[PDB]
Amino acid sequence: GHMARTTKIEEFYAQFGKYILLVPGKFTGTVAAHDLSTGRTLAWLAGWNYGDTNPIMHHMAAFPSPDPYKGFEFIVNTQGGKNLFIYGIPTTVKEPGEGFNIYRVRYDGTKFNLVSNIAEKTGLGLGVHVTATPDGKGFAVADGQKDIFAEFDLATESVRTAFLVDWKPNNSDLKRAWLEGGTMTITRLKPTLPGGKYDYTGTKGCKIDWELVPGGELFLEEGKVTGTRQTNVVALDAFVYDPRGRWGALSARLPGVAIIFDRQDWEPVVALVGAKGEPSSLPVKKVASDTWEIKMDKVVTPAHQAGFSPDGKNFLFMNGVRQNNIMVWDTSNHADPTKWTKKAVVEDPGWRGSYPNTFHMVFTPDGRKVYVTLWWPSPTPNGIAVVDARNWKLLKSVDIGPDMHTLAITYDGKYVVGVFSGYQKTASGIVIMDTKSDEVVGILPSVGGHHDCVIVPKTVEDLRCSRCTTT
Template sequence: MSINRRQFMKGALTAGMAGTATMLGSSNAFAAVHDPVGEAQADLFRKFKGNVILLPSKYGGYVQAMDPSVPETLAWYPYGLYGIDMPIPHHIAAMPSADPYKGFDFYQTMQPPAAPYVNENSPEWRNRGDFKMFKMRYDGSGKQNSITVVNDISATTGMALGVHVSIGVGENANKYVAFADGQKDMVLITTIDDNPKIVKAFRADYDPIARQLNVSQVFPDATTGKFDYIGRKGMKTSHEAMLGEELMPADPTAVFVDAFTWHPTLPFGAILIRRLGCCAIVDTRTWEVVALLSTAKGAPDNFPLVKQSGFTWTFAVPSVLTPLHEAGFITSGEYFLACNNVLQNNIAVYRSTNEDPTKWKKENFVEGFGTKFLPLHMGNVPDSRFAYFTMWARKPNNGYICKVDTKTWKVTAKWDTGPDPHTCDCTVDGKYMTTVYSGHQAGQSGIVFINIESDKIEARLPCPGGMHDHVVVPESWEGLKYSRSTSV
């Protein structure tokens, strides 16, 4: 039997395609979402299906979207493509998506590298980078996943802030996103559309002579409709304060505003003020400052309002027993928790159900952390049974993650996940707490998955680039309540 070259090639190609189909199955490695069936790791990681995790690399200058069920990076975006010299992607928050593999939007803040941790490691970076806020979009609808910039919100609004970002929930769901910055002591709230509109902005200033805090609304230029706080304009301090630096700010008016967190059931938000150990509660129906919580143990529940003059609220702050760093609401909204640190290492527990925030009272404290470990970030679970906290420590100490029972306010479990631990965020099914560690921007780094019921570490994956923050993309607006918007 003879066979010509054309017949041979046709037969070989057909056989090869059949063999490839057998090996790869119906979903192959060239699809935008990979099916790892038949791969050795598939059984271990399939439990994480449905979760897409955003991981910004603080030193690497990029953000990646990870599918831990494969595991693989779905897409990544280097912010240098936007023309930023030495970008420092800082904090992140994701909009809800019923199918994050197909697409979702998220927000990213960026700060200049002129911070002490950079000065220690790379002093030549001090004058590089920029303050930025971006609305970003992940698109997984085609054969090639991608992440793109939707809007440079700092350029659109004229205000560039570089610390926490949080998306409104509850009565503020599907409306607003908030940005904050501790070098400028400002908060900006915008709409969530692709061409965002300015909703409200605040600035906080301390008067060290009168011992008073002024929280003021600030307004864009009436002609341009924009602020004049692009880049480094408006900075009080040259860098974001490290833990402990709250005690000796270079600018005596500085208070190191950290974030704006949203109440999950009531129309309130909290401006977190690190230096003074307090949180200004804002009524999001009127954007008035209605209370100033004083979170330290031994301090009153609220600092008193001295006066309101126009769009400025002045509160008496006669003494500061401790700074704070990070605070937020549990998923149910029943409690507001504040991480006091540096002078007091404890977590204040406020009952936050009253519609008058001046009546929110401290009911308990989570304690026992000693002087080495500082409460830092907070993570929620859907049913509010537990809250997770990062206990940060200066190198060469590792720090750890702890689990707190919200009935007894006792620590029930601890994990030394790795050096320089940071944020905690729950998977969409409520079964696992994810947490990242960054090795002080140079050493070991990764993401850990902790089983909420068994307290067992189920998986660990490498994350090079010093992840200072991360977020699991929530599946709904209700799911956003236990994402990183009610707490930071």
């Protein structure tokens, strides 16, 4: 009785409404847009076609468009160098392409158009998270090998600001370089080359020869990561935006700190400390016209993914490995981030091992729930946690597949759309979950190693639940 009828897929797609999913491919080298209303891939682009020999397509953010089906724009970046070598692909390449490109891409209703390489224009080759600003007219990119971030103006493709962050360990032994504390220095960079250009193209500036992979923060302390400035790494990750404006939070994985910046004067203002049992924050002291310091007696655990709720009144930071939890601050005081204080921590008995790590997130538009990926190394199924974002309690956990990454949400709040990525070698897919029932409604095929995904927004209100406020 199991094969009594032919079934058409139309009702499945019809439920989602008119939303376009954008995904980067990591080791596939592609970017693609999928129409969730029809199942068609609207367009794709392959970086190698354009002469990028190492197009590790990493992160992306899309800007609001009045009609995504007629056109939209996004930024997607790449890694480079020896990052080709760290996912177990048995390549014999000797000298990988330099990479670290930042591409502006426009969909025109038919195809993608590679508009510009902002890395080549600006001299900032930055390979980790890309976030749109809340107004949709700028974007930030961070890098965790170079420990640089910058905010860019979209219209002019210009650098608004760039900062370097450095670690000076108390204990010079690699094993203890973070555990026993140190000083974090934050320096506002100035361009050094003609045309206001920075000197950070390609692999230039890397302190370590490849990224700290998902769940691999501690690989550095273990001697598993080569580089010239191993004990000076903080592993910057993202600059996420307060949807109320003015503030952004820079995540630094190895110290487990989120540094709050004033975007209106480009200065750091306070450092939030992730670890459970540690203070809410540490002060930032100005030590020169362009230089600030944070002093830490210890680092309890690394942290990684970070985000504001849609109303900006909560900030989340995911502690990992030494602790696996969701740390929550009360950010309701928009006037003064030095008053932001820890208010809750989400924990679970099942999170007590090294893995799972609390990972990428997305909030419902109404702020009632937050969905959080649960990452594990092979072979444990990865999943999605459903958290009550008013009382800060775990509601449900669901298994999905290997190597779960990002979550997006349709802007009416009805469906979460996520990606899993096979460690660049095994099963991959797009997963869709109904937010009313918290049930998976289906998996779609995906040729991708995606560490990101976005739904193309129509308005700045949509950005509150896109790649702007959270990773």
